[PDB]
RNA sequence: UAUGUGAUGGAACCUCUCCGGAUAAUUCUAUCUCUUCUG
């Protein structure tokens, strides 16, 4: 398809990816902290612990 | 709610350090209570 130099809106996709949402949820808003945990995670030496 | 000839992020241990410890005989004698009416 070449489309270099094409930054694209309307010009033709032979193979084209939707986005991905969530079943049975297209509205519903909820907010960040309704649905997610928030974790550190550290990286450690081995060396000394 | 991406934009398309290119995403090892499964590509990273909240790890490390610190005596719930210290002191104490389950023992034993002095009152308690305020208004009495001329005495």
């Known amino acids: 398809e070449k489309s270099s130099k094409t930054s694209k809106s309307p010009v033709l996709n ?9 079943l049975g949820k297209e509205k519903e808003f909820l907010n960040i902290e309704d649905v997610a945990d928030m974790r550190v ?8 612990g």
């Open 14 to 22: 032979n193979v084209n990816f939707s986005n991905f949402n969530v």
């Open 41 to 48: 995670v550290n990286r450690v030496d081995q060396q000394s």
